[PDB]
Write a protein that binds this ligand. Structure first.
Ligand SMILES: Nc1ncnc2c1ncn2[C@@H]1O[C@H](CSCC[C@H](N)C(=O)O)[C@@H](O)[C@H]1O
Length: 351
């Protein structure tokens, strides 16, 4: 179609058609069926927790966790729980599945039975999910690998055809997306751009990232960046970057227009914003991330069921914050059971 983004030809189909190693293929069932199941195991635990809270006359600690509780209650009371009646599992069937689901079934086995403990404050959700780096592997899991691959693939296209590209990654964390990007853009550790600014809210990640990304360490710079705050005030050079990568982070901010405006301050006009985001809430994500305070960062501006936005919503937000909107959307899967995407947008001069 000759569609271009950031000056290179790319299409949704070009990215979405890529098939990559995923545990669901290897386990191996179809994504839509598994999505039914990975989410299927969660529905059981959600239902149990809601039933247990109510029967025991318990209420959650009076903080963000009540929002989590509300979502689980609605999931059950809306009748959505029963529909998920359609899939019945004996307690034998349930555990038998989970052993096969690698990272995902495993978070369910970890977190599912701890829902009441988290709600009532007997279990520290973050510490709990982080043990054995389970949270970090969740990012590496099949759940988000395809969207990360979309991003890496676009970065490769960009860096292979254009030289001296400057990249900044927001919320790089332990480098799950980064690792995919670097592996495609610099398969042999060769220099491939003029700058890769590795950033996160917390510098605590940087040490492990350097080790994880050792093959590329001399090409990476590391700096703290709270994207909720003015980037210039944080020692960054405004409007110098050609590509910004933000995987699974932008939603975790308090006010999306403020965050996007800050992203804009970093990009050159014509610069590309690579946004990797979940497209919608699923019970599994509610279970997995809903227990964490960061999930509820947007409640004050109405993101009260989850921090997430649909692609259409991101499109509008982008247009209001100096971007072109969604130039390209690539989804992990086709149909209703899709849950993640890459959104590419172009920074526009406000002048
Ligand atoms: N306000 C903020 N500014 C910059 N980073 C933030 C942030 N709030 C949360 N983050 C970071 O965003 C990351 C989200 S987890 C995503 C990790 C990685 N991008 C991946 O996809 O695999 C965390 O490391 C967290 O520290």
């Amino acid at each position: 179609s000759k569609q271009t983004v950031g000056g290179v030809h790319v299409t949704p189909e070009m990215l979405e058609s890529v098939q990559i190693p995923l545990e669901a293929d290897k386990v191996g069932m179809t994504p839509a069926e598994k999505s039914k199941l990975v989410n299927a195991a969660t529905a059981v635990y959600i239902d149990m927790a809601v039933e247990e809270m109510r029967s025991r006359g318990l209420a959650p600690k009076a903080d963000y966790r009540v929002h989590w509780w509300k979502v689980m209650q609605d999931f059950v009371d809306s009748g959505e729980g029963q529909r998920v009646q359609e899939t019945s599992l004996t307690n034998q069937e349930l555990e038998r599945v989970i052993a096969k689901l690698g990272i995902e079934g495993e978070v369910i086995a970890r977190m599912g039975p701890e829902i009441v403990n988290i709600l009532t404050g007997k279990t520290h959700a973050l510490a709990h999910i982080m043990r054995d780096d389970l949270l970090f592997r969740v990012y590496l899991s099949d759940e988000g690998r395809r969207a990360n691959r979309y991003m890496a693939e676009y970065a490769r296209l960009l860096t292979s055809q254009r030289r001296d590209i400057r990249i900044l990654e927001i919320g790089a964390g332990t480098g799950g997306t980064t690792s995919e990007v670097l592996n495609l853009c610099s398969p042999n550790g060769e220099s491939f751009c003029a700058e890769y600014m590795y950033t996160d809210l917390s510098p605590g990640f940087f040490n492990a990232a350097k080790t994880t990304l050792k093959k590329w360490e001399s090409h990476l710079a590391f700096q703290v960046l709270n994207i909720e705050d003015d980037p210039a005030g944080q020692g960054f050079k405004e409007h110098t970057y050609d590509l910004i990568i933000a995987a699974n982070v932008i939603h975790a901010t308090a006010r999306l227009t403020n965050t996007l405006s800050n992203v804009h301050k970093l990009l050159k006009p014509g610069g590309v914003f690579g946004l990797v985001e979940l497209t919608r809430l699923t019970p599994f994500y509610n279970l997995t991330f809903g227990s964490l305070s960061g999930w509820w960062a947007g409640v004050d501006e109405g993101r009260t069921e989850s921090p997430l936005q649909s692609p259409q919503q991101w499109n509008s937000l982008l247009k209001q914050t100096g971007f072109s909107g969604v130039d390209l959307a690539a989804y992990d899967l086709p149909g209703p059971e899709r849950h993640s995407c890459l959104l590419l947008s172009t920074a526009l001069s406000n002048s």
